[PDB]
């Protein structure tokens, strides 16, 4: 009863502390640490957290980042249906973020363009041309402002031109960091309670 | 914009009408109709519904019932992990209902006992003895009030006694109807808007 209220409070503190450390690892390109921290958070989810809309946003972000971090591994499946590559799965999470964070198409569009682009190109690098075409056609926009990129890609899949500048100039690292940038902007900048108490406590000590 | 607000309203009316028809089919043991209606609702979920906590409850109920209806088919998997038989998956949905509907252990207990019992016995009927044992041990309660049932079952798995009264007297139909009874009690009894307008409209006509 009370013991569960108290556990809830701690669990949320734990969750927020690790989320903060997960973003820091991600920002520092320490993806190994990111994944391990991600697993700790995954384990905490079966426990009572209560309600904060702060954690749902928190969790939607982790969700998207987790899929983006494993984006270059087409052996991974974050979904019921094996079909979905991690990035395709990231697109779906982004759509959930749009709806839940009540964001406009214009705001989510830039992010999305980057994820769709990355999804197609990673498939192309693995010469999963057929898969790249399907992803391109279902997701890719046909906007007048993206039609050239879409045509280049469609053509690259055509000739299987893995040597095309579009493919060679693609930086997954930059892609990842830009995505973190965007997702990060829908979160508060505060220091999680535990890190605060850890900075205090840690300086009780000395010498 | 507005067009999406309006679609939301209709979608919720559609969802509630079919939920109502799904329960009616279930109550009438017309599981074929239930499944088809379930698929219509599954399709609507990708669409905008908005917020009503009324639909979340609605959906958690459909979720549990859907797993219970396919309970005797151990080839079905409603989960990420193939391991889970439908009923085991129903237990998980029930736990979600408890938390979300903020129900007490005493209230959810009876339902749960029935689902756990059914899960074990269906595995036993298919002579999935090992599976039945694992489910028994992880989920089954050890309460003083259920220990005899647990021992009988453990023994039945022992001798592979599919002819034991406990196995032979088990009625999946009665189990299903009792579960509907319980889940139904956390929902309002009102007539969905569309059925109301359908009763009016339908009686404009005559002769």
């Amino acid at each position: 009863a009370g013991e569960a209220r108290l556990e809830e409070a701690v669990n949320r503190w734990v969750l927020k502390f690790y989320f903060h450390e997960a973003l820091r690892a991600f920002r520092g390109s320490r993806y190994g640490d990111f994944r391990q921290i991600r697993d700790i958070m995954q384990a905490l989810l079966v426990r009572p957290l209560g309600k904060e809309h702060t954690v749902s946003r928190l969790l939607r972000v982790m969700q998207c980042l987790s899929r983006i971090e494993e984006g270059e591994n087409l052996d991974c499946s974050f979904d019921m249906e094996a079909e979905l590559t991690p990035l395709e799965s990231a697109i779906n999470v982004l759509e959930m973020i749009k709806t839940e964070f009540t964001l406009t198409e214009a705001v989510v569009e830039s992010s999305r363009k980057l994820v769709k682009e990355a999804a197609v190109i990673i498939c192309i690098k693995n010469k999963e041309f057929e898969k790249a075409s399907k992803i391109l056609k279902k997701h890719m926009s046909k906007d007048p402002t993206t039609q050239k990129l879409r045509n280049d890609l469609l053509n690259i899949i055509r000739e299987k031109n893995l040597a095309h500048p579009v493919i060679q100039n693609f930086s997954y690292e930059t892609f990842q960091q830009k995505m973190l940038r965007f997702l990060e902007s829908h979160l508060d900048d505060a220091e999680p309670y535990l890190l605060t108490m850890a900075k205090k406590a840690l300086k009780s000590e000395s010498a | 914009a507005g067009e999406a607000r309006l679609e939301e309203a209709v979608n919720r009316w559609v969802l509630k009408f079919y939920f109502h028809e799904a329960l009616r089919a279930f109550r009438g043991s017309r599981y074929g109709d239930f499944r088809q209606i379930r698929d219509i609702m599954q399709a609507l979920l990708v669409r905008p519904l908005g917020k009503e906590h009324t639909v979340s409850r609605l959906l958690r109920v459909m979720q549990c019932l859907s797993r219970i209806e396919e309970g005797e088919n151990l080839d079905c998997s409603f989960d990420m992990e193939a391991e889970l038989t439908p009923l085991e998956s129903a237990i998980n949905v029930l736990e979600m209902i408890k938390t979300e509907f903020t129900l007490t252990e005493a209230v959810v207990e009876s339902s749960r006992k029935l689902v756990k019992e059914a899960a074990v016995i269906i595995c036993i009927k298919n002579k999935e003895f090992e599976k039945a044992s694992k489910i028994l041990k992880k989920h089954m309660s050890k309460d003083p009030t259920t220990q005899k049932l647990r021992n009988d079952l453990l023994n039945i798995i022992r001798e592979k006694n599919l002819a034991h009264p406990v196995i032979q007297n088990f009625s999946y139909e009665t189990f299903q109807q009792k579960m509907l009874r319980f889940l139904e009690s956390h929902l309002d009894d009102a007539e969905p808007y569309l059925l109301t307008m359908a009763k009016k409209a339908l009686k404009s006509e005559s002769a």
């Binding site: 994944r35 995954q42 991974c76 499946s77 | 990420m80």
Partner: peptide, 10 residues
């Protein structure tokens, strides 16, 4: 929420 980590299998 739903899953942070993947399931293996693609």
């Amino acid at each position: 929420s739903f899953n942070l980590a993947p399931l293996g299998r693609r």
